[PDB]
């Protein structure tokens, strides 16, 4: 399953001018575009090397879309102050994420479009793409308004059409890197805790995509209950890294193995401290 997703953030800054608006585009988990209203030259730009086929008109068009949206988000933040009777004095945030997940049949699997005010659900487009869920009484005003205006239909048309067409195109264009699989470079380290115990750490670096399985075992038995894990983290170069650790008795390290599995392998890799 693949997706095209856009993320918008507007942050008000009283006494400092208009809100800053930032829009970021994602194909699957890869950031591929960015617009920042605060940039010396506020323009939508590629954040990836494989978007070079698009013309100047492409980025010009996106830029104007985001500029128009920035204006809307400013209005949204002002309106929210009224709805919630809040002061013009404080900073507030308004966020949107929307996009399309496509099934192997090449058609929309799930379209979504959600909004948040100050980091909490405000209003969202339901899965049927024909109705809204309002999170509170303020958002119920918006719901009434968007229902009267027939907003849902236009969003559904986008999610089912342009969004899907775009994903198809970008996936095709970024194919060589988006769909690649770089296997992890994995190894085991050994760190004494005390006289009785030591830490065995199973490392995996430089892998893509980010999904990976690291499983400590004791004489063949799955020990995925006593492992210490870190959340998979970005290497900074587009790859990911992660480790899984187990505390074992000193002198019994040889009884344990780390099983590493990832798309870029073929079959599991079995590692051990020796």
């Amino acid at each position: 399953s693949h997706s095209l997703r856009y993320f918008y953030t507007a942050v008000s800054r009283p006494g400092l001018g208009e809100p800053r608006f930032i829009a970021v585009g994602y194909v699957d988990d890869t950031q591929f575009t960015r617009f920042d209203s605060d940039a010396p030259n506020p323009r939508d730009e590629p954040r990836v090397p494989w978007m070079e086929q698009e013309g100047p008109e492409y980025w010009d068009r996106n830029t104007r879309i985001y500029k128009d949206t920035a204006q809307i988000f400013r209005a949204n933040l002002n309106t929210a102050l009224g709805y919630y009777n809040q002061s013009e004095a404080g900073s507030h945030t308004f966020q949107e994420m929307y996009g399309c997940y496509v099934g192997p049949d090449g058609r929309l699997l799930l379209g979504f479009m959600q909004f948040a005010y100050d980091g909490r659900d405000y209003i969202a487009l339901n899965e049927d793409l024909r109705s809204w869920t309002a999170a509170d009484t303020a958002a119920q005003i918006t719901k009434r308004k968007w229902e009267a205006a027939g907003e849902a239909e236009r969003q559904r048309n986008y999610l089912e059409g342009r969004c899907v067409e775009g994903l198809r195109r970008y996936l095709e264009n970024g194919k060589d890197t988006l769909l690649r699989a770089d296997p992890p470079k994995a190894h085991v380290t050994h760190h004494p805790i005390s006289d009785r115990e030591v830490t065995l750490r199973c490392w995996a670096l430089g892998f893509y995509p980010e999904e990976i399985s690291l499983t400590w075992q004791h004489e063949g038995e799955d020990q995925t209950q006593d492992m210490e894990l870190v959340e998979t983290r970005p290497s900074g170069d587009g790859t990911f890294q992660k480790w899984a650790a187990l505390v074992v008795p000193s002198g019994e390290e040889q009884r344990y193995t780390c099983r590493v599995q990832h798309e870029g392998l073929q079959e599991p890799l079995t590692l051990r401290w020796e």
Binding site: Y6, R61, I65, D68, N76, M113, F115, T142, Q155
Partner: peptide, 9 residues
């Protein structure tokens, strides 16, 4: 390509 901005809230 992004969608055109949704109606104001």
């Amino acid at each position: 390509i992004p969608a055109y901005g949704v109606l104001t809230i």
